[PDB]
């Protein structure tokens, strides 16, 4: 029992970040002996206890009330970084224990997982703490989407913590997608009124690239499909017909190749986008042709005017629509009626 008392001070020194007043080999001896002259299922329970003791004492700092959200998150982050560093070092000294249970097939968690359970149980499981954590994480994401600068490293570390604790999906991911949906749904309707189609398309492309950046940087990889789908839905899918009926004629009547290429690129991301565009492409060609045979221009011969349009239109299929056959075929069938 004098042997175990050695480690109790070693663990407490690591927890209080003080000095390990023994040579490391002496501690390696303590763990090796206590596992071989009794049952090892007696040393593991003691270590959990003093790990449980220390971590239960870290909950009080998150009770300060009326505390700034970013400061609260940074206090969570520090507590997490301290827990990992402590547990990683604790695991090094107790490695013989950690692998003895692995060598024989024990059901008891590894020391690292044992620490994760305690951190989840006594820190994050507290609803008020978790709720203020998730609110703050979402609020930073919202702040960034509104253009303000935030600590992405803090964001990356906290979400990584939620992943290591295996609560990323339950506690964060669903609320995150819901807030992404509401934000871009409102943003879609709002900028669809306030900005012209060229400026709206440029903005949509900027958002799709931004969300790709947030995904690479601090979100988890499993959020990729749902996030991109949500942004694509609320900024494009809900406005496909509305964007064309507001801007397509203006885009073609001015031969706006660069904005037209972007239109094809963005509509390719959504179900039915190329199709709805292809439909209005037919309607535009049928309209333009039937307005030049009913009311002709006056420059040169009209058959030639019926050739500049073909040059102009073939060029748009070639560059804006990427030689897409369906647009060449649709142009002919439109003219035959």
């Amino acid at each position: 029992d004098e042997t175990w008392q050695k480690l109790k001070e070693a663990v407490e020194a690591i927890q209080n970040s003080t000095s390990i007043k023994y040579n490391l080999e002496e501690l390696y001896q303590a763990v090796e002996n206590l596992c071989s002259y009794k049952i090892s299922a007696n040393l593991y329970k003691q270590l959990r206890q003093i790990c449980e003791d220390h971590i239960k004492a870290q909950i009080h700092q998150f009770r300060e009330d009326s505390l700034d959200s970013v400061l609260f998150l940074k206090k969570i982050d520090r507590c997490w970084q301290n827990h990992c560093r402590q547990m990683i070092m604790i695991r090094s000294i107790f490695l013989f224990l950690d692998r003895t249970y692995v060598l024989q097939n024990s059901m008891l968690p590894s020391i690292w997982d044992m620490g994760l359970e305690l951190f989840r149980a006594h820190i994050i499981s507290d609803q008020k703490v978790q709720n203020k954590t998730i609110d703050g994480i979402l609020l930073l994401i919202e702040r960034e989407r509104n253009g303000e600068a935030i600590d992405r490293s803090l964001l990356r570390s906290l979400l990584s913590m939620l992943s290591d604790l295996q609560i990323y999906q339950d506690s964060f991911e669903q609320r995150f997608l819901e807030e992404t949906n509401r934000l871009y749904a409102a943003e879609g309707q709002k900028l669809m009124q306030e900005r012209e189609v060229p400026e709206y398309l440029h903005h949509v492309n900027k958002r799709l690239e931004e969300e790709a950046d947030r995904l690479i940087t601090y979100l988890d990889q499993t959020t990729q499909k749902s996030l991109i789908a949500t942004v694509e839905k609320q900024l494009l899918g809900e406005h496909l017909t509305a964007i064309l009926q507001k801007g397509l004629n203006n885009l073609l009547d001015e031969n706006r190749i660069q904005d037209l290429s972007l239109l094809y690129q963005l509509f390719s991301r959504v179900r039915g986008g190329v199709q709805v565009l292809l439909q209005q492409w037919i309607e535009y060609i049928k309209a333009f042709g039937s307005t030049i045979v009913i009311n002709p221009e006056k420059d040169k011969t009209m058959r030639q005017e019926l050739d500049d349009f073909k040059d102009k239109v073939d060029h748009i299929i070639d560059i804006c629509f990427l030689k897409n056959e369906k647009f060449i075929n649709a142009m002919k069938e439109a003219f035959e009626t």
Binding site: G289, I292, V293, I294, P296, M302, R303, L306, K310, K332, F335, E336
Partner: peptide
């Protein structure tokens, strides 16, 4: 004005 519906049908056959 009816000299253009004919010109369109010719262009449509040719094109």
């Amino acid at each position: 004005p009816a000299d253009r519906w004919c010109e369109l049908a010719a262009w449509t056959c040719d094109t």
